[PDB]
mmCIF file of C-alpha atoms in Angstrom:
data_model
loop_
_atom_site.group_PDB
_atom_site.id
_atom_site.type_symbol
_atom_site.label_atom_id
_atom_site.label_comp_id
_atom_site.label_asym_id
_atom_site.label_seq_id
_atom_site.Cartn_x
_atom_site.Cartn_y
_atom_site.Cartn_z
ATOM 1 C CA UNK A 344 -23.516 -9.399 5.020
ATOM 2 C CA UNK A 345 -22.389 -6.497 7.227
ATOM 3 C CA UNK A 346 -23.753 -3.086 6.105
ATOM 4 C CA UNK A 347 -20.768 -1.045 7.384
ATOM 5 C CA UNK A 348 -18.312 -3.114 5.323
ATOM 6 C CA UNK A 349 -20.511 -2.962 2.210
ATOM 7 C CA UNK A 350 -20.632 0.821 2.513
ATOM 8 C CA UNK A 351 -16.823 0.899 2.778
ATOM 9 C CA UNK A 352 -16.346 -1.413 -0.214
ATOM 10 C CA UNK A 353 -18.758 0.722 -2.246
ATOM 11 C CA UNK A 354 -16.940 3.947 -1.425
ATOM 12 C CA UNK A 355 -13.395 2.615 -2.109
ATOM 13 C CA UNK A 356 -11.958 0.376 -4.808
ATOM 14 C CA UNK A 357 -9.837 -1.882 -2.637
ATOM 15 C CA UNK A 358 -7.169 -4.061 -4.263
ATOM 16 C CA UNK A 359 -7.228 -2.235 -7.617
ATOM 17 C CA UNK A 360 -5.960 -4.214 -10.570
ATOM 18 C CA UNK A 361 -4.441 -1.092 -12.148
ATOM 19 C CA UNK A 362 -2.096 0.032 -9.373
ATOM 20 C CA UNK A 363 1.148 1.765 -10.334
ATOM 21 C CA UNK A 364 3.786 -0.119 -8.347
ATOM 22 C CA UNK A 365 6.728 1.107 -10.481
ATOM 23 C CA UNK A 366 6.937 4.384 -8.570
ATOM 24 C CA UNK A 367 8.617 7.440 -10.091
ATOM 25 C CA UNK A 368 9.006 9.102 -6.696
ATOM 26 C CA UNK A 369 7.813 8.818 -3.127
ATOM 27 C CA UNK A 370 8.653 7.372 0.256
ATOM 28 C CA UNK A 371 7.554 4.028 1.641
ATOM 29 C CA UNK A 372 7.473 2.949 5.298
ATOM 30 C CA UNK A 373 6.785 -0.249 7.204
ATOM 31 C CA UNK A 374 4.008 0.091 9.791
ATOM 32 C CA UNK A 375 3.927 -2.455 12.615
ATOM 33 C CA UNK A 376 0.512 -2.474 14.278
ATOM 34 C CA UNK A 377 -0.070 -3.575 17.845
ATOM 35 C CA UNK A 378 -3.263 -5.505 17.063
ATOM 36 C CA UNK A 379 -5.778 -6.409 14.395
ATOM 37 C CA UNK A 380 -8.313 -4.191 16.156
ATOM 38 C CA UNK A 381 -6.240 -1.122 15.209
ATOM 39 C CA UNK A 382 -6.070 -2.230 11.561
ATOM 40 C CA UNK A 383 -9.872 -2.679 11.585
ATOM 41 C CA UNK A 384 -10.385 0.791 13.084
ATOM 42 C CA UNK A 385 -7.872 2.329 10.672
ATOM 43 C CA UNK A 386 -9.709 0.916 7.688
ATOM 44 C CA UNK A 387 -13.137 2.047 8.795
ATOM 45 C CA UNK A 388 -12.117 5.560 9.825
ATOM 46 C CA UNK A 389 -9.265 6.276 7.359
ATOM 47 C CA UNK A 390 -6.868 7.295 10.135
ATOM 48 C CA UNK A 391 -3.677 5.978 11.653
ATOM 49 C CA UNK A 392 -1.568 6.764 14.694
ATOM 50 C CA UNK A 393 2.010 5.644 15.346
ATOM 51 C CA UNK A 394 4.213 6.198 18.409
ATOM 52 C CA UNK A 395 5.398 9.691 19.288
ATOM 53 C CA UNK A 396 8.713 9.030 17.502
ATOM 54 C CA UNK A 397 6.990 7.258 14.617
ATOM 55 C CA UNK A 398 4.521 10.112 14.134
ATOM 56 C CA UNK A 399 7.439 12.579 14.093
ATOM 57 C CA UNK A 400 9.203 10.622 11.317
ATOM 58 C CA UNK A 401 6.080 10.080 9.223
ATOM 59 C CA UNK A 402 4.950 13.684 9.594
ATOM 60 C CA UNK A 403 8.350 14.882 8.457
ATOM 61 C CA UNK A 404 8.327 12.542 5.462
ATOM 62 C CA UNK A 405 4.841 13.644 4.459
ATOM 63 C CA UNK A 406 5.700 17.339 4.653
ATOM 64 C CA UNK A 407 8.971 16.725 2.776
ATOM 65 C CA UNK A 408 7.100 14.827 0.006
ATOM 66 C CA UNK A 409 4.444 17.530 -0.429
ATOM 67 C CA UNK A 410 3.714 17.769 -4.174
ATOM 68 C CA UNK A 411 6.638 15.499 -5.020
ATOM 69 C CA UNK A 412 5.228 11.985 -4.607
ATOM 70 C CA UNK A 413 3.065 9.673 -2.499
ATOM 71 C CA UNK A 414 3.911 8.307 0.946
ATOM 72 C CA UNK A 415 2.966 4.620 1.192
ATOM 73 C CA UNK A 416 2.525 2.548 4.350
ATOM 74 C CA UNK A 417 2.939 -1.223 4.344
ATOM 75 C CA UNK A 418 0.978 -2.637 7.265
ATOM 76 C CA UNK A 419 1.790 -5.738 9.266
ATOM 77 C CA UNK A 420 0.467 -6.733 12.679
ATOM 78 C CA UNK A 421 3.192 -7.687 15.184
ATOM 79 C CA UNK A 422 3.812 -11.436 15.276
ATOM 80 C CA UNK A 423 1.332 -12.153 12.466
ATOM 81 C CA UNK A 424 3.607 -13.619 9.800
ATOM 82 C CA UNK A 425 1.962 -11.603 7.042
ATOM 83 C CA UNK A 426 1.382 -8.177 5.604
ATOM 84 C CA UNK A 427 -2.252 -7.130 5.625
ATOM 85 C CA UNK A 428 -2.526 -4.049 3.422
ATOM 86 C CA UNK A 429 -1.161 -0.851 1.946
ATOM 87 C CA UNK A 430 -2.424 2.664 2.620
ATOM 88 C CA UNK A 431 -1.375 6.102 1.398
ATOM 89 C CA UNK A 432 -0.751 8.866 3.939
ATOM 90 C CA UNK A 433 -3.070 11.770 3.160
ATOM 91 C CA UNK A 434 -2.468 14.437 5.832
ATOM 92 C CA UNK A 435 0.213 15.658 8.223
ATOM 93 C CA UNK A 436 0.051 14.574 11.851
ATOM 94 C CA UNK A 437 -2.502 16.257 14.110
ATOM 95 C CA UNK A 438 -1.525 16.037 17.809
ATOM 96 C CA UNK A 439 -3.837 15.999 20.840
ATOM 97 C CA UNK A 440 -6.265 5.872 23.283
ATOM 98 C CA UNK A 441 -4.600 7.321 20.161
ATOM 99 C CA UNK A 442 -2.653 10.489 21.056
ATOM 100 C CA UNK A 443 -1.942 11.660 17.498
ATOM 101 C CA UNK A 444 -3.829 11.111 14.276
ATOM 102 C CA UNK A 445 -3.209 11.401 10.566
ATOM 103 C CA UNK A 446 -5.448 10.592 7.568
ATOM 104 C CA UNK A 447 -4.791 7.533 5.426
ATOM 105 C CA UNK A 448 -6.428 6.042 2.356
ATOM 106 C CA UNK A 449 -6.437 2.254 2.380
ATOM 107 C CA UNK A 450 -5.600 0.847 -1.048
ATOM 108 C CA UNK A 451 -4.798 -2.839 -0.592
ATOM 109 C CA UNK A 452 -6.541 -4.968 2.039
ATOM 110 C CA UNK A 453 -5.276 -8.543 1.660
ATOM 111 C CA UNK A 454 -3.039 -10.979 3.541
ATOM 112 C CA UNK A 455 0.351 -11.540 1.943
ATOM 113 C CA UNK A 456 2.407 -14.125 3.884
ATOM 114 C CA UNK A 457 5.924 -13.083 4.880
ATOM 115 C CA UNK A 458 7.488 -15.921 2.844
ATOM 116 C CA UNK A 459 6.514 -14.093 -0.357
ATOM 117 C CA UNK A 460 8.591 -11.089 0.759
ATOM 118 C CA UNK A 461 11.518 -12.264 2.855
ATOM 119 C CA UNK A 462 13.941 -12.471 -0.101
ATOM 120 C CA UNK A 463 13.785 -8.654 -0.334
ATOM 121 C CA UNK A 464 16.438 -7.242 2.006
ATOM 122 C CA UNK A 465 16.960 -3.660 3.206
ATOM 123 C CA UNK A 466 20.480 -2.318 2.833
ATOM 124 C CA UNK A 467 19.522 0.413 5.379
ATOM 125 C CA UNK A 468 18.623 -2.129 8.085
ATOM 126 C CA UNK A 469 21.791 -4.265 8.195
ATOM 127 C CA UNK A 470 20.548 -6.155 5.151
ATOM 128 C CA UNK A 471 17.820 -7.815 7.232
ATOM 129 C CA UNK A 472 14.698 -9.014 5.361
ATOM 130 C CA UNK A 473 11.987 -6.416 4.804
ATOM 131 C CA UNK A 474 9.711 -8.703 6.895
ATOM 132 C CA UNK A 475 12.005 -8.159 9.911
ATOM 133 C CA UNK A 476 11.529 -4.371 10.083
ATOM 134 C CA UNK A 477 10.569 -2.105 12.974
ATOM 135 C CA UNK A 478 7.757 0.436 12.935
ATOM 136 C CA UNK A 479 8.319 3.297 10.394
ATOM 137 C CA UNK A 480 11.390 1.634 8.868
ATOM 138 C CA UNK A 481 11.820 3.400 5.522
ATOM 139 C CA UNK A 482 11.977 1.180 2.428
ATOM 140 C CA UNK A 483 14.381 2.321 -0.333
ATOM 141 C CA UNK A 484 12.313 3.038 -3.403
ATOM 142 C CA UNK A 485 13.765 0.239 -5.538
ATOM 143 C CA UNK A 486 13.003 -2.419 -2.916
ATOM 144 C CA UNK A 487 9.592 -0.837 -2.319
ATOM 145 C CA UNK A 488 8.746 -1.335 -5.992
ATOM 146 C CA UNK A 489 9.405 -5.050 -5.541
ATOM 147 C CA UNK A 490 7.299 -5.199 -2.387
ATOM 148 C CA UNK A 491 4.441 -3.305 -3.998
ATOM 149 C CA UNK A 492 4.558 -5.523 -7.088
ATOM 150 C CA UNK A 493 4.385 -8.638 -4.921
ATOM 151 C CA UNK A 494 1.572 -7.401 -2.663
ATOM 152 C CA UNK A 495 -0.342 -6.033 -5.621
ATOM 153 C CA UNK A 496 0.000 -9.272 -7.593
ATOM 154 C CA UNK A 497 -0.495 -11.813 -4.806
ATOM 155 C CA UNK A 498 -3.613 -13.954 -5.210
ATOM 156 C CA UNK A 499 -4.699 -13.721 -1.580
ATOM 157 C CA UNK A 500 -7.025 -16.227 0.067
ATOM 158 C CA UNK A 501 -8.030 -14.046 3.006
ATOM 159 C CA UNK A 502 -8.033 -10.595 4.571
ATOM 160 C CA UNK A 503 -9.004 -8.857 7.791
ATOM 161 C CA UNK A 504 -12.382 -8.282 6.107
ATOM 162 C CA UNK A 505 -13.188 -11.959 6.557
ATOM 163 C CA UNK A 506 -13.266 -11.169 10.295
ATOM 164 C CA UNK A 507 -15.191 -7.905 9.957
ATOM 165 C CA UNK A 508 -18.270 -8.877 12.000
ATOM 166 C CA UNK A 509 -15.985 -10.277 14.684
ATOM 167 C CA UNK A 510 -13.959 -7.082 15.041
ATOM 168 C CA UNK A 511 -17.093 -4.913 15.074
ATOM 169 C CA UNK A 512 -18.386 -7.069 17.930
ATOM 170 C CA UNK A 513 -15.111 -6.733 19.830
ATOM 171 C CA UNK A 514 -15.097 -2.934 19.559
ATOM 172 C CA UNK A 515 -18.747 -2.656 20.552
ATOM 173 C CA UNK A 516 -18.412 -4.949 23.523
ATOM 174 C CA UNK A 517 -15.286 -3.258 24.791
ATOM 175 C CA UNK A 518 -16.938 0.126 24.475
ATOM 176 C CA UNK A 519 -19.868 -1.102 26.607
ATOM 177 C CA UNK A 520 -17.523 -2.542 29.246
ATOM 178 C CA UNK A 521 -15.486 0.659 29.282
ATOM 179 C CA UNK A 522 -18.513 2.901 29.714
ATOM 180 C CA UNK A 523 -19.813 0.617 32.447
ATOM 181 C CA UNK A 524 -16.451 0.710 34.223
ATOM 182 C CA UNK A 525 -16.570 4.517 34.216
ATOM 183 C CA UNK A 526 -20.097 4.562 35.674
ATOM 184 C CA UNK A 527 -19.152 2.520 38.722
ATOM 185 C CA UNK A 528 -16.309 5.026 39.373
ATOM 186 C CA UNK A 529 -18.354 8.274 39.402
#
């Protein structure tokens, strides 16, 4: 058992059974991640960073939703075929590998295959399936309720947490290599 993950699980009630998916207000966005390593980092440090344009959109949404409702992020790694979790945005974007940064609170951490969601289509993206969205695509609230119900209710068999020790190793090893590469250059 990894101690870092057990500390995270103790401090947060991931995959809560009593999640309010029938939202009264709020804004919901698709987040496309470049890699699993970013999802892993986001979960351990409760931060996210999008592109410059993505950060501008999400920052605006967060400030526009201040004291009116939550902003939810539906995460999927590019080319993965599944959604891997849901986080709430908890701060505006702070600028200046990740250029920007904003706080997030991870709520669901579980793999939901795209075939459970592809029947939900987005009228604001040429009626393409919600699983065929670009980064920071906004989800109309009524379709977002259906997505959140499905993700919340799905009996998942796996999550990124099953690979926790692997992703820790990857980060550690890369950090060593990076520091070494700097040393040879000074």
